[PDB]
Amino acid sequence: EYRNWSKPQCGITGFAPFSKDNSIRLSAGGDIWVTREPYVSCDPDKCYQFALGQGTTLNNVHSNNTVRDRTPYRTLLMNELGVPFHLGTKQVCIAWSSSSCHDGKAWLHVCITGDDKNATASFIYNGRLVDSVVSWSKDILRTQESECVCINGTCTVVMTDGSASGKADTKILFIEEGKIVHTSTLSGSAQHVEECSCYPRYPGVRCVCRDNWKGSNRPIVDINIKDHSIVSSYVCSGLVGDTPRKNDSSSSSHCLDPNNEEGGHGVKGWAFDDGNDVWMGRTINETSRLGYETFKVIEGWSNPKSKLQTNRQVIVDRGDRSGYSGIFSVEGKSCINRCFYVELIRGRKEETEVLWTSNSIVVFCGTSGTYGTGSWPDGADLNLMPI
Amino acid sequence: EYRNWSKPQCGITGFAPFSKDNSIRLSAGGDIWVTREPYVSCDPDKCYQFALGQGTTLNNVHSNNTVRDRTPYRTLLMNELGVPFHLGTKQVCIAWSSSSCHDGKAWLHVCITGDDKNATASFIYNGRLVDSVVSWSKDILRTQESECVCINGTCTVVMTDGSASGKADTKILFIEEGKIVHTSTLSGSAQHVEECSCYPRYPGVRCVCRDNWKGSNRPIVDINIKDHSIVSSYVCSGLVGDTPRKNDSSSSSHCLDPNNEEGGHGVKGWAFDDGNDVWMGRTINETSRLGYETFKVIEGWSNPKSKLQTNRQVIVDRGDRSGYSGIFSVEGKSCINRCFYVELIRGRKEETEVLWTSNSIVVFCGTSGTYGTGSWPDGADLNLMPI
Amino acid sequence: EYRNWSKPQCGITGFAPFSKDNSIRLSAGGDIWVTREPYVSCDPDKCYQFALGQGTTLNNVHSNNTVRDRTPYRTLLMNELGVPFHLGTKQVCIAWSSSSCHDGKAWLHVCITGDDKNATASFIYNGRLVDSVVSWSKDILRTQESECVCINGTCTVVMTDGSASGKADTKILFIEEGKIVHTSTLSGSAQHVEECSCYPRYPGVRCVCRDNWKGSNRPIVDINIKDHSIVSSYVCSGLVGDTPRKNDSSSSSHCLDPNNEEGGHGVKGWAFDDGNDVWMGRTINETSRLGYETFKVIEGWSNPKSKLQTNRQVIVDRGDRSGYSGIFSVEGKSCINRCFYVELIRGRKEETEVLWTSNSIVVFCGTSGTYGTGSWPDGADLNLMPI
Amino acid sequence: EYRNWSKPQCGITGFAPFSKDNSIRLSAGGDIWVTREPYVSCDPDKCYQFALGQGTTLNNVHSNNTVRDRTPYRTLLMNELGVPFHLGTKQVCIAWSSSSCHDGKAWLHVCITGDDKNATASFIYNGRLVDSVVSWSKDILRTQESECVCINGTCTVVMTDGSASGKADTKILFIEEGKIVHTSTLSGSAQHVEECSCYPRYPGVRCVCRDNWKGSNRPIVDINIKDHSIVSSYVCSGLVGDTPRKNDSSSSSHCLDPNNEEGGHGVKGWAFDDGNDVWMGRTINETSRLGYETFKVIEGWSNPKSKLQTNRQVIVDRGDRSGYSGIFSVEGKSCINRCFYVELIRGRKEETEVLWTSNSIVVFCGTSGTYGTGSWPDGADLNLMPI
Ligand SMILES: *[C@@H]1O[C@H](CO)[C@@H](O[C@@H]2O[C@H](CO)[C@@H](O[C@@H]3O[C@H](CO[C@H]4O[C@H](CO)[C@@H](O)[C@H](O[C@H]5O[C@H](CO)[C@@H](O)[C@H](O)[C@@H]5O)[C@@H]4O)[C@@H](O)[C@H](O[C@H]4O[C@H](CO)[C@@H](O)[C@H](O)[C@@H]4O[C@H]4O[C@H](CO)[C@@H](O)[C@H](O)[C@@H]4O)[C@@H]3O)[C@H](O)[C@H]2NC(C)=O)[C@H](O)[C@H]1NC(C)=O
Ligand SMILES: *[C@@H]1O[C@H](CO)[C@@H](O[C@@H]2O[C@H](CO)[C@@H](O[C@@H]3O[C@H](CO[C@H]4O[C@H](CO)[C@@H](O)[C@H](O[C@H]5O[C@H](CO)[C@@H](O)[C@H](O)[C@@H]5O)[C@@H]4O)[C@@H](O)[C@H](O[C@H]4O[C@H](CO)[C@@H](O)[C@H](O)[C@@H]4O[C@H]4O[C@H](CO)[C@@H](O)[C@H](O)[C@@H]4O)[C@@H]3O)[C@H](O)[C@H]2NC(C)=O)[C@H](O)[C@H]1NC(C)=O
Ligand SMILES: *[C@@H]1O[C@H](CO)[C@@H](O[C@@H]2O[C@H](CO)[C@@H](O[C@@H]3O[C@H](CO[C@H]4O[C@H](CO)[C@@H](O)[C@H](O[C@H]5O[C@H](CO)[C@@H](O)[C@H](O)[C@@H]5O)[C@@H]4O)[C@@H](O)[C@H](O[C@H]4O[C@H](CO)[C@@H](O)[C@H](O)[C@@H]4O[C@H]4O[C@H](CO)[C@@H](O)[C@H](O)[C@@H]4O)[C@@H]3O)[C@H](O)[C@H]2NC(C)=O)[C@H](O)[C@H]1NC(C)=O
Ligand SMILES: *[C@@H]1O[C@H](CO)[C@@H](O[C@@H]2O[C@H](CO)[C@@H](O[C@@H]3O[C@H](CO[C@H]4O[C@H](CO)[C@@H](O)[C@H](O[C@H]5O[C@H](CO)[C@@H](O)[C@H](O)[C@@H]5O)[C@@H]4O)[C@@H](O)[C@H](O[C@H]4O[C@H](CO)[C@@H](O)[C@H](O)[C@@H]4O[C@H]4O[C@H](CO)[C@@H](O)[C@H](O)[C@@H]4O)[C@@H]3O)[C@H](O)[C@H]2NC(C)=O)[C@H](O)[C@H]1NC(C)=O
Ligand SMILES: *[C@@H]1O[C@H](CO)[C@@H](O[C@@H]2O[C@H](CO)[C@@H](O)[C@H](O)[C@H]2NC(C)=O)[C@H](O)[C@H]1NC(C)=O
Ligand SMILES: *[C@@H]1O[C@H](CO)[C@@H](O[C@@H]2O[C@H](CO)[C@@H](O)[C@H](O)[C@H]2NC(C)=O)[C@H](O)[C@H]1NC(C)=O
Ligand SMILES: *[C@@H]1O[C@H](CO)[C@@H](O[C@@H]2O[C@H](CO)[C@@H](O)[C@H](O)[C@H]2NC(C)=O)[C@H](O)[C@H]1NC(C)=O
Ligand SMILES: *[C@@H]1O[C@H](CO)[C@@H](O[C@@H]2O[C@H](CO)[C@@H](O)[C@H](O)[C@H]2NC(C)=O)[C@H](O)[C@H]1NC(C)=O
Ligand SMILES: *[C@@H]1O[C@H](CO)[C@@H](O)[C@H](O)[C@H]1NC(C)=O
Ligand SMILES: *[C@@H]1O[C@H](CO)[C@@H](O)[C@H](O)[C@H]1NC(C)=O
Ligand SMILES: *[C@@H]1O[C@H](CO)[C@@H](O)[C@H](O)[C@H]1NC(C)=O
Ligand SMILES: [Ca+2]
Ligand SMILES: [Ca+2]
Ligand SMILES: [Ca+2]
Ligand SMILES: [Ca+2]
């Protein structure tokens, strides 16, 4: 019954289109939730889309000023992958920061809400609140904003608390059926860890996070489910996946330290290793969240100084808006597949023709077959949309 | 198969956020039922939200004059906890007063509708009408407006018939698979019992009710599911839970009689005992349904005169609107958890910029862990909402 | 697995409120189907509501001229009892005349559509067309517009083909798993048989129909499931149940023939026997479909002269609009319960304030307990409703 | 658990009405997806309707110029047959060309999206992306736009890549649990094959496709599942089924070569054999997609030159708009039934009073019983609908 993820990783030549919600285009006519920070997590049968709602729909007076990150009205929305967030969507918890797990038996939802300086993380398993923890650093308590990983019934979630531009207290929480059985402080050379994209790498869990303080390379967290040991490093690929960053010719990376190159900010992204190579996704624009591309870097997991990429796919065209991206793993007949979602942010603080901020999602899954090219942007025309 | 509730009560240090519907905020764009008197009740798998609809949506001509409590068009709406009352919501019965039960096998709905002087209580178990009873006092027959409790197949419901300002005929009905197998009149020191927040306290059921006549101290009712024996008293804490009430310094309780302190009105509320202590919720405002706080009174269940607060939590900010609150119990892996919901009333008779009266809910569940602070109001701005 | 209906009839002292959809009231804000001729049928777990949609919602340009009975766009809508016919409602077949069956294993739908003089009846069982029959009299082929009855896997449906103002070819069709295994021409003294309300009277099926030709007393069709025998008579009760009819002073019934009293025209209605007594429902208004009452006539199933009324209930107030009414049976724990629905027609012809014709439904179920009084009309204000 | 379709073909005397969508009529009030190229597939329990959405609803600013066939926002929508494509509809994949299969265990969705010259076909089985293939001719890679057929766990899909007017590369793909196990190049005497309407003809699969280059007669692809052999021919029927075509008096067929009679364009249609006879459907207009008729041709499957017709049914009236039509097979108790759908296109490039292009569907199933006449058009009044 419990998921162990003991199958090997599927061979990947690239990624094929999997799902698209068209949320903003459907919002022009119809009642669609205002969302941001989405992710995808699958039970053994089907996949689900999650998002942090803003307590309002897009064609709504309350969609004004929905660029704010933390409000009391934010809830975690949960639909089947493909079903857009309409008025029949279930909100499973109060959360302006979220992470969701299926251990093979039931869903685990990790939900953070409340005051910025005194925040509660609620742990809801099988529809019941099982445990809760208060912010330890008395700062903005935040979690992965993506799917977490359960192996043998033990789910791991990464939680950060403290300064976003300085030393912060990151904890790895071990949850069994909604109950916190252990809490390990982050160890290793990753100095700043935030919004980890975690995937099962049996016998443990590997997380690729964002360094929001001093690195454009992505921190790596390796979690051993049995021993509970934590080790930290950075993605060694010379092509860094964080935005902002330097250009490919000028960007540099380090196997153990942040590269100190346009690292003061960041975006949620993902990466996974295929032997010594790394499969990564990032925004095409080096400074803004415009476009999205995925590629494989040869020896990009074991060698800094490697800027040799291949199998590049354009997910979102460079002229179109992207946002958070994360990984999620789907068990196959014989192997574990790696899939990723891209959040397509539209609205305020970058497009001022509307008063709201919302997102769409495009989902791609790894394939061992062949694929073509294309681009799958949000596609809404905000000049004609209600304000 | 039949829920017994024989597990002990979970150790509670407070309550963690559980659910929020944002009903009024979603009403501004989208078709949402006009509801009042909500409550939460869970089958052994997931929790459900209930409310008494007004036969209309909010952006509707029929949402005017919806402050009225008893209309022929009121129905009991039932969704999964989290799903807002959209047009796909199932109205399970006709009722302007309702109570719902799950005994572990099927749902029991107690639904009261009809003429105020001659009302019918229909008992629907497993989707069928199994029994019905007429008013005995030929006055407004009313029930809990919250979850009832079923132990070993037998569900107990408190029903009141008579004046809200003088002796009323309160009966406890024992229902097995929808059939009324016993009816016992209320006996004990509580003289006005209405809208009882009942919870399982094995081997019995304990209800904390509203005295609309002479009390600010909430009445208590204890049912022996075995001897169909009913005992009545009041809550002993010197910090009373009813609204209106006196200051915290000037208030008193007797917990064998009403305190005769500003007791000429009331609001549905909850309290449960933790040894000699009492966990209780109330409005922060002593005169109006503004704000909501929960706290634990030291020896507040046994010592009239205890006013020692601890573990206070602000659920709704004092400036924000609250309403009915009630308790519901969720079975855990080793203990029984106590959770509560707060109805957030918005609209007429207190906010005259709209013509409708409706509510959202916020749900909190007892936690043995830690939590922070916050406030989770309705959040809808009625100045911009359709009138 | 197959339903036999072998239990006796539950002792009925009257009827208690069961369900109310508030369709027209919710139509003012929200997308609700335009329907007419509804009915209720239940599978061994839930009750479903059916209606003949007009291919449009109420707030729609196509709701104009929805007073037409037979259009190519009419489909049979099927929702759970309580869920209003919103946009997510499933239309199970094309039909402007319908009847639905659950034999304990799967749903049977008898759907009539096509030309008025060459109508086609489709038989859909378990989601599949199993059989089809053409109109045999080349006039409006019609069926019960209510639930049909299956015993031991054999469902029986009453179909009429011919004129509404004279003799018509009424046939009784025996259907097994969607397949017509036998077709019996109507036999007996009933001269015009239409829109039968059938209930299981084990070992057979009893149908109370309307005479649209020469009688205000309701015809009876007795169907033997074992022998496929058909027997026809009239409800003997001197208080006739059809509309139009004579006043209670001048009503007469023959118990074998139509009474020749305002018998032209009619409304779909219901009746069932309780020993020698009859439980029947009818419009309060003798000439119009205004109001609804249910009562019991003492010795009304055997004595053509009995006018002794008792146990009268007002379902819809005298000034409010009723419509079609029909019976459906629910298997209880020890007996078979009889329930009835009343269609609440609103709109064109009678109410010229709107351009559409639609309906709401109110459902009552038999009870052995006590009950009060009340009135549950449609309750929509058509002066403010969109036209 | 795997569907073998081993039962004989049902004796068919004609077709009976099964399902109607009314999508465009419901679009006037209510949020309904803009769709085109629909089809029907059934699992062992019930039937589902599929359509290629345009990423927008009809009463939407993005509904403008929805006449384009390939956009990044097009997705495959999936509801149960009878549920209109409302906002709760699940889009199961990104596709502007699609084909869907149920093999008895799980759904297989074949979805093509991306650039015109480098389109990607994604193979999604049981909710997971299993395989993927790129365009082989670097042109518009397209598939059946109807249900594919699975036998003994092996599903077969016909894929065309290349010129729409000229020789193109057609491949038959054998898919097992989402994985492409074999790929067969089209062989036989058919020169242009597109949008095949395939049905199980045990022990193989037979497809009736459209010749878009040189023929108004329809090509036939016979697929042997046992040994993956492909043979091709045309339909001998002197009454050809493609639109445009010549009139009945001047048409002809060869069933080894295209008839070279107004074969420059085409429409997706269906045919199946009844011994030596053929049941086919086509537009009543020989040059436009107006009306729809079905009939049987005596010796039409084995004799070019036959023009003898029987059992003609008008599905859509001659002056009403039709579109794509395809076949789907339903397993009965003892026989395999052949059913078909007709797409009712409304909107741009033929009706200029609206800016959108969308469709409704009507479904008919084969019957061994009797049936009447009728016409079941889309029925929306576009002069009154929003742009
Ligand atoms: C139909 O779809 C398929 C799949 O989507 C497309 O095929 C894919 O095409 C992409 C290129 O469009 C292949 O990407 C790989 O690109 C590597 C470099 O990427 C470039 O883009 C990034 C953008 O950020 C730039 O930074 C890079 O530029 C910098 O670095 C390069 C280094 O060379 C410098 O040249 C630049 O000046 C910049 O400084 C690039 O612009 C590329 O290196 C990679 O590798 C091929 O070439 C190397 C070296 O020559 C070979 O060693 C290697 O084996 C590859 O060549 C093989 O494969 C190709 C394709 O089969 C054959 O033609 C060769 O003969 C040889 O066998 C590669 O180009 C991606 O790999 C490829 N995917 C697949 C699955 O093949 C099709 O284009 C598309 N067709 C259409 C639209 O018509
Ligand atoms: C981050 O989150 C946590 C969790 O939410 C928060 O910690 C909680 O803080 C509240 C403070 O409200 C603690 O609640 C308890 O409040 C009791 C008094 O309630 C007061 O408010 C109501 C309305 O405002 C008034 O009616 C009462 O006033 C009456 O009585 C006071 C008496 O002082 C009079 O001043 C008034 O005039 C009225 O007559 C109160 O004002 C309070 O009594 C209770 O107990 C603490 O204080 C007493 C008395 O000194 C101590 O005996 C007792 O031990 C408690 O003090 C602490 O003791 C130890 C210290 O190590 C620890 O056990 C705790 O720290 C404990 O607080 C108490 O104040 C609630 O208990 C607490 N929840 C926890 C820790 O679980 C944090 O505030 C929040 N932080 C930030 C940064 O926002
Ligand atoms: C609280 O709710 C309960 C439950 O809903 C209500 O009680 C029910 O009340 C109704 C009406 O009072 C009872 O229905 C029966 O009505 C029969 C006549 O119906 C009348 O309405 C129809 C339509 O308008 C008219 O056509 C009739 O008029 C014609 O007939 C009468 C006589 O038949 C003529 O006088 C007229 O000129 C017309 O020709 C009526 O207006 C009624 O006959 C029936 O019988 C009771 O009364 C007769 C005469 O006394 C007795 O012989 C018979 O045995 C019945 O008496 C019973 O009831 C009393 C108490 O009710 C007991 O003490 C006796 O033991 C005996 O059981 C009856 O009136 C319906 O029966 C009743 N249901 C119950 C009790 O379950 C309450 O009224 C309501 N109270 C409120 C609103 O406060
Ligand atoms: C109630 O519903 C039922 C069922 O839906 C309807 O019955 C069906 O009616 C249709 C139409 O009559 C029957 O279809 C058959 O049509 C054949 C060809 O149809 C014609 O239309 C097409 C297109 O419009 C034309 O192409 C045809 O060819 C003509 O035009 C070309 C031009 O190039 C000329 O060259 C031709 O010469 C034609 O002029 C036709 O106009 C038709 O061939 C077929 O034939 C019957 O009659 C022939 C000759 O008389 C017999 O050989 C053959 O066996 C058929 O006879 C049987 O059926 C009739 C009718 O049932 C019986 O009377 C006979 O006893 C015998 O059983 C035929 O007409 C369709 O078969 C029929 N479906 C049934 C019965 O299941 C009812 O009409 C409808 N009733 C209403 C509206 O009241
Ligand atoms: C990456 O994105 C930024 C836009 O986000 C582009 O820079 C802008 O260029 C336009 C003119 O084309 C100016 O009006 C804006 O002020 C610029 N900056 C911003 C932050 O808006 C930039 O050209 C893009 N290209 C790359 C590859 O850096
Ligand atoms: C709480 O309520 C009591 C009783 O109403 C208040 O006591 C009154 O206080 C005022 C001003 O101090 C005096 O003039 C009155 O004589 C007091 N008695 C009465 C019966 O009114 C007390 O002030 C209130 N305190 C708070 C915390 O608001
Ligand atoms: C409890 O709530 C009432 C409102 O229901 C408060 O009364 C208001 O007080 C404010 C500020 O003093 C005035 O501006 C309003 O006009 C008052 N409203 C009315 C009519 O009462 C009351 O002050 C609150 N009490 C406490 C202790 O906060
Ligand atoms: C069917 O098609 C044929 C051929 O297209 C038509 O025959 C032509 O009719 C026109 C008059 O309209 C003549 O001028 C041509 O010479 C004819 N051509 C042939 C091939 O003879 C025929 O009229 C059409 N018939 C129907 C019933 O539409
Ligand atoms: C109550 O029911 C539970 C079912 O989980 C059972 O384990 C327990 O032993 C029962 N206790 C009593 C008092 O019957
Ligand atoms: C129903 O089935 C039983 C056998 O299961 C049989 O004895 C009985 O006669 C059947 N009833 C009818 C009415 O056909
Ligand atoms: C096809 O499936 C049915 C049901 O499983 C089975 O009875 C039949 O033998 C099968 N035929 C073949 C060819 O396997
Ligand atoms: Ca950074
Ligand atoms: Ca009181
Ligand atoms: Ca009549
Ligand atoms: Ca052609």
Side-chain angles (χ1 to χ4, degrees), chain B residues 247 284-290 318 350:
Chain B
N247 287 327
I284 305 188
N285 188 303
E286 304 116 2
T287 46
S288 44
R289 299 170 183 186
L290 280 181
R318 55 168 333 121
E350 256 77 45

Side-chain angles (χ1 to χ4, degrees), chain A residues 2 31-33 54-64 66 71-75 86-96 111 113-124 126-135 138 177 179, chain B residues 15-22 24-32 42-47 80-84 86 330-333 337 362-382 384-386:
Chain A
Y2 278 147
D31 314 314
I32 297 280
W33 278 86
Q54 297 269 4
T56 185
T57 56
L58 198 140
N59 211 345
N60 200 304
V61 287
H62 302 106
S63 66
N64 199 11
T66 37
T71 87
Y73 328 116
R74 301 207 80 185
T75 50
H86 69 300
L87 270 204
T89 300
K90 186 201 274 264
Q91 32 202 344
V92 303
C93 67
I94 319 179
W96 44 252
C111 309
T113 189
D115 286 352
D116 298 345
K117 278 171 172 40
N118 221 9
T120 317
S122 286
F123 296 77
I124 292 152
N126 204 29
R128 310 152 216 295
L129 191 136
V130 182
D131 213 348
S132 84
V133 72
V134 70
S135 176
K138 296 316 168 191
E177 300 206 293
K179 176 63 71 169
Chain B
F15 305 88
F18 191 50
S19 193
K20 203 179 181 320
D21 42 334
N22 294 296
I24 318 288
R25 282 172 63 88
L26 298 162
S27 296
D31 298 298
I32 298 284
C42 319
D43 65 18
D45 295 280
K46 73 185 57 170
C47 287
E80 290 161 290
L81 186 56
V83 190
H86 67 297
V330 175
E331 196 169 292
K333 194 174 198 204
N337 203 27
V362 59
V363 183
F364 275 63
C365 268
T367 187
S368 305
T370 46
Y371 45 85
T373 53
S375 162
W376 297 266
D378 177 69
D381 183 50
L382 302 194
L384 322 169
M385 273 198 57

Side-chain angles (χ1 to χ4, degrees), chain C residues 288-323:
Chain C
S288 287
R289 299 168 180 185
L290 285 163
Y292 201 82
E293 61 198 356
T294 55
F295 49 81
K296 178 212 229 172
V297 191
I298 295 306
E299 277 92 62
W301 199 262
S302 45
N303 185 232
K305 276 178 53 204
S306 72
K307 302 234 247 188
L308 230 57
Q309 208 202 82
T310 190
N311 285 309
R312 181 177 179 264
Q313 268 170 276
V314 171
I315 306 305
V316 179
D317 190 67
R318 144 178 317 270
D320 287 300
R321 287 192 71 184
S322 57

